[PDB]
């Protein structure tokens, strides 16, 4: 088809709520969904929880992600030049992500100081979106939505390890710490992931397949990159012009196919995808697109600004051989692999592979004594952003059971990691095309640590995540070759894997206990009785953390800010209605609108902010949307 | 929160009854339970029944149980220190336990002299939980309660061996032994499994997760170990004081966080954790409270007195090669693993693993004949006891399809465990608190066999279970090893594994049929059409086998009496309505209570006084127990049926 | 005369084997409390009247297994009637 | 006695086979001590019976200890009757 009257650019999160609720209020209206990347629709490696770990390979096979490198090196990561990977199907990171359930503080929302985005304002539409399947103590979870919510089919012994940990170093045991309140405390983690079929809670299958199942009104375009939006005479969106994903016609030419809309535009293209689209139409800083000869249709010059991120650290531990991982399967032990798939085949309600094994954690906040400890920036940014807005957790942490991290540089036997994400980071970042042409990288800056107030926590979130490793029954040791470079005489140095650990890993092996090299300090074998007191820190102990966060800190693919909402002035590019400043008929709903980070990992945002987008297109058209949503294929 | 309506300390079988229909029978009543051990929810190391056997490991990695061992070495057991387990989970016992369903005979309920607990009063209340799914000729069990029953998925080729023996020595077969009234008779022994799920019926996903998953009102806190009872001025319960399950904070250093109740505080903590809680709490003996350094609630001599049990033995016999057993699937062969947990995914209804192996079984009870040797202090216990009491069994019996004993000291080969226990015991213990601090050790004392009656029947069931072994067809001889110390020329002692079946185990080995050493006597090879005679035992013999119940007995994990349900003038705990003396808004509702024995695995028992507890505790706060409790998470969508 | 696929005692839907016990027997124990199952018991004789009126049934073991090889018979009475189903070989003796 | 305290002394030592030894009194000092639970634990590391006291059959032995001191089994009449009784059930050609 040529013509439609919505078309959405992007098949992530926020678009397929987009294109899904639009669709389903009005069976005339005709609404296209434009995706990038491949369809997912009853794909056993997007449909299976239990594999997402694959999605971030380097391979040259995997495609369901791009990779964005810095265009430079950055100083504050001590000369490395940061990637930042970002989804390429359809359902978007729906498709390929963790699949942890967070959610946001009320204040995030408040703070974007928006009429209609006040937490009040979006609880509503946050229960409209979830089928919340596990146990709680309060009324904040939907029970009727399209995208279901569960601890999955098997948590593993480690959860309740770390929590008992946890508790034993003073972060209180909470039944949910996704209730918009909660900023220092521990839960079971909960997982997009559907308690009774097993199945991953993809935005795509919920909102868009759905759909098209009993209707022949939303249209399905992927594989189909957005180049550039068409303008009226008077800036008002006409249509949309895309190219194939892979750039192989004849001569390397250029193949635009042009799709017109009638009603509106929506951009969905996500964070990195919308601003590029925006750029490379004629909307962005005028002078980048002067040089890039670009007709200007709207100077913004906030577009492909403000990218902010979560900054991952991950603290890898050994642990017991008795103790259950996903290494193994990691590694792809064949018979591992074969009966973890079989055992999701044959009952998925109760499967290991009906989860992300992510399956514990924390939302943390200091204490007066703690932030003493940190530094003068830190205790600025304290006052000026936290400290009359107790709601917000400074540090996320985690527990794997398993190894986050190739395992071609591993050691054998087993592993949890520390999963730790800075929550609201002061670092800041940007991202711009280079050219006319959609198929090249555009100039990239994570920004990451550019600001000197973004350690402190981290530091401080390393020094607590080792403390309740330390405090486990399956703690056997600190992985020293991917832990800070202390001094080796520091009482804060590593202490790896012990004899009794090491033998029991390869008990015919002529080499284990052989100390020549001096590589590594032994533990001393796992006592039941030990007596534990904190790891104390110098000044030196310190600085080699800082280097270590500089060194291997990384996105948390949370990211958002680049198309951001609020007045014009501000730099801001959308209306509180999400409309692009100086354009009629145009959209960005993604997470590239927020004006501010969010205590979360971010596909509650993006589910919510499509949400809200898809009333803001519902009463501009005078539509009315439908709860329930279209029954989602395979669900009860 | 930090404030609730209920708190119940401790979430055993009893624990799950009372905070799961407290917070179905009103939603606006905000409770609490809080548990020492780990949350159950889900974990297929609890939900499978099958691998119940790894729950009693000392073995460094299994945290499921507590092991409390006696201070001090027991003359009554030649020297040993006897080991009493009890439950460090959510769900307590029903977690972790054998999973035999068994019910206590109508007298022993009586026996309580306590108005409210009579038979007739509890019957109503026997029904409620029950969930029966099996067939039998009378009306006495219950089918809309949450606790499934059944036969599971496959009962083994031996439970009919069994009873065919059973009925071949003078105990009569029944459809139905768990009736109130049976106290002689042999049945096909049913298990707290559900026949369609095939999963473990525990009382937590019953009575508490199902609540749970409907409403927000009911507060679970696991791995919190109750220190204390915090008390008014007046000796009025406000609220509780816990500790983490691991004294793994900065030092081993004590953090309390405390949490309070308006209405009720119930102890459900079981025999050994609740005195130790009313104890520390201010409730006990003064004596040893004013020693401890613990100011004074209500003096109490008997918290922690009068701790009753059943008392376990083991016949261990091995069986024919083609015998289907639990052996090798409890040794950790791979590929027998491997194929029993796939089953139990693929069709729980039908699964080997949807059972727990004990599948046929007997209460008995001896002749006029036989009393005569039983000697003259167990026919004291008997004129005074069960002589006009004749709806209670003396001993128990059930045969295991496998060895119950640590594999590590068993010789290869397939085996099955005559499982007794000696069913209202004269002996007695206690168990006392040796500090404040809950991370220390109580001191205990099991109290096994300090009555000189309990003996005579523990040996009785010893020759009997034989007799029986002896007249299986799978019967391939005793395990010398495990059984008594018999003279070597006596009639009476032990005959082990056939040559035959002895070649069939090791078809390739070198040592099998090298007589030297003599280190067992040789059973002829099976034989169908064999004629077998009683043992003649002589009192050489029977000292023996009473030396082998000094040196082998054991508990039966049915712990109770500590805090007893009688008048306080003769050392009660608490009142006829379960609330402790001298305190207001305290309860102890768990088998603490009992003041006296129950001939019953007592799962049952403990869900009972659950009920009874929910009951006493609901016209109290004027609410009404809903019927039926909310739906089971995974059961079926639920009068009699297939 | 004549050839056909040939069905068998089987449940299509469930694969299993349509016995008779379970068929007419196990089915009604399992809904009420009046159909009573003595297995592993062969039945001696049945003990008769004055009048030649069935009156009971004497039963054994399956197992010749008694002290002395001493035959154990249990007796069940009947009010109305006895019914002989022990097949052709067994009714007879 | 003698061959005993060579099997104690050596450093492949884990126990007595409690089964065929002598018939000891449970708290004579002279009594086997049985495998160690570390050792019984690497015989079947799977096994769900490992470490189950339960049946009380075995003392079992202290896991092994490169620097431990030994002394002798003392030995009273008592003893010396189970060893005598011992040679009697065991000796051989
Ligand atoms: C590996 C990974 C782990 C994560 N971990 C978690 C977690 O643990 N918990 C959690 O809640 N969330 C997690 N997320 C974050 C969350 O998934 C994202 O924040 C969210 O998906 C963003 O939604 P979006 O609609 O803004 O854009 P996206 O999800 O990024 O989707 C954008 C879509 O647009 C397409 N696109 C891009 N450019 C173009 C173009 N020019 N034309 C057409 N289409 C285009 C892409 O192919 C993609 O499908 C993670 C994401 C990833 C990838
Ligand atoms: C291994 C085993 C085998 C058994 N076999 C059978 C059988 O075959 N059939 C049968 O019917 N029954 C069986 N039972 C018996 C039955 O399970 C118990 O009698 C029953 O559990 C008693 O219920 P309770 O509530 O009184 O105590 P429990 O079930 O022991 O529960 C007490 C709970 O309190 C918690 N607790 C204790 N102290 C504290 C504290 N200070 N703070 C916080 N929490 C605390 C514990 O973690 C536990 O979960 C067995 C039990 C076990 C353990
Ligand atoms: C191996 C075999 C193959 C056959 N093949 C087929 C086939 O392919 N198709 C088909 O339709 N039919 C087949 N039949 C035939 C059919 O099963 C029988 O003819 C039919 O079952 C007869 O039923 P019945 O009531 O006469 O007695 P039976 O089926 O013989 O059962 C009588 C019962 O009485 C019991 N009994 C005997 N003596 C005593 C006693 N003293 N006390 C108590 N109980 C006693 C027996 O244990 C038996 O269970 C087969 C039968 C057998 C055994």
Redesign the interface.
């Known amino acids: 088809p040529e013509e439609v009257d919505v078309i959405v650019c992007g098949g992530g999160p926020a678009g397929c709520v987009v294109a899904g609720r639009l669709a389903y209020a009005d069976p005339t209206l005709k609404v296209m969904l434009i995706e990038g990347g491949a369809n997912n629709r009853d794909d056993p490696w997007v449909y299976r929880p239990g594999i997402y770990v694959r999605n971030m390979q380097r391979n040259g096979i995997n495609d369901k992600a791009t990779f964005y490198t810095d265009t430079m090196a950055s100083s504050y990561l001590r000369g490395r030049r940061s990637i930042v990977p970002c989804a390429n199907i359809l359902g978007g990171g729906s498709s390929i992500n963790f699949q942890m359930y967070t959610r946001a503080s009320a204040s995030d929302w408040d703070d974007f100081k928006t009429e209609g985005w006040t937490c009040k304002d979006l609880l509503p539409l946050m229960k409209r979106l979830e089928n919340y399947q596990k146990?709680?103590?309060?009324?904040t979870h939907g029970y009727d939505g399209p995208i279901a919510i569960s601890?999955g089919?098997?948590?593993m012994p480690v959860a309740?390890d770390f929590?008992?940990?946890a508790?034993?170093?003073?972060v209180?045991?909470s039944?949910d710490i996704q209730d918009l309140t909660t900023a220092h405390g521990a839960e079971i983690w909960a997982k997009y992931i559907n308690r009774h079929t097993g199945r991953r809670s993809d935005a795509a299958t919920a909102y868009v397949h759905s759909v098209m199942d009993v209707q022949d009104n939303l249209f399905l375009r992927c594989n189909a990159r957005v180049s550039r939006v068409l303008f009226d005479d008077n800036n008002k969106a006409v249509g949309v012009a895309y190219v194939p994903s892979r750039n192989r016609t004849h001569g390397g030419k250029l193949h635009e196919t042009i799709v017109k809309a009638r009603k509106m535009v929506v951009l969905s293209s996500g964070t990195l995808g919308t601003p590029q689209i925006l750029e490379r139409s004629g909307v962005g800083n005028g002078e980048l697109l002067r040089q890039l000869g670009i007709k200007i249709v709207s100077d913004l010059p906030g577009v492909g600004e403000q990218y902010q991120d979560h900054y991952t650290t991950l603290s890898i531990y050994r642990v017991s051989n008795?103790s259950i991982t996903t290494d193994d399967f990691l590694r792809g032990v064949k018979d591992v692999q074969r009966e973890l798939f079989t055992?999701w085949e044959?009952?998925p309600?109760?499967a290991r592979l009906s989860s992300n094994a992510i399956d514990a954690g924390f939302k943390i906040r200091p204490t007066e004594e703690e932030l003493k400890e940190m530094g003068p920036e830190f205790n600025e940014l304290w006052n000026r952003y936290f400290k009359d807005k107790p709601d917000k957790p400074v540090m996320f942490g985690s527990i794997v059971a398993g190894a986050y991290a190739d395992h071609t540089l591993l050691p054998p036997g087993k592993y949890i990691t520390m999963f730790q994400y800075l929550e609201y980071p002061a670092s800041r970042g940007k991202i711009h095309i280079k050219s006319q042409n959609p198929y090249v990288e555009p100039f990239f800056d994570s920004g990451f640590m550019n600001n000197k107030a973004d350690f402190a926590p981290i530091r401080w979130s390393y020094k607590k995540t080792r403390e309740v490793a330390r405090?486990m029954?399956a703690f056997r040791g600190e992985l020293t070759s991917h832990h800070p470079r202390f001094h080796p005489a520091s009482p804060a140095a590593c202490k790896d894997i012990d004899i009794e650990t090491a033998k029991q890993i390869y008990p015919d092996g002529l080499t284990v206990g052989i100390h020549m090299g001096s590589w590594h300090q032994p533990s001393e074998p796992?006592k039941?009785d030990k007596?534990?007191?904190?790891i104390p820190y110098t000044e030196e102990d310190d600085k080699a953390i800082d280097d270590w966060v500089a060194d291997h800190v990384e996105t948390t693919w949370h990211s958002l800010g680049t198309c951001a909402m609020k007045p014009r002035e501000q730099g801001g590019v959308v209306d509180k209605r999400l409309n692009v400043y100086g354009t009629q008929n145009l959209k960005c709903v993604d997470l590239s609108i927020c004006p501010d980070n969010l205590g979360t990992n971010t596909y509650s945002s993006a589910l919510l902010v499509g949400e809200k987008g898809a009333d803001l297109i519902a009463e501009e058209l005078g539509l009315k949307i439908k709860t329930p949503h279209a029954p989602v294929p395979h669900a009860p």
Do not use: F, M, T
């Not at 508790?167 to 003073?170: E, N």
């Not at 007596?531 to 904190?534: K, L, S, T």
């Open positions: 146990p709680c103590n309060n009324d601890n089919g098997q948590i309740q929590l008992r940990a508790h034993a170093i003073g209180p045991y039944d008795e055992e044959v009952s309600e109760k405090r029954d796992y039941h007596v534990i007191e904190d």
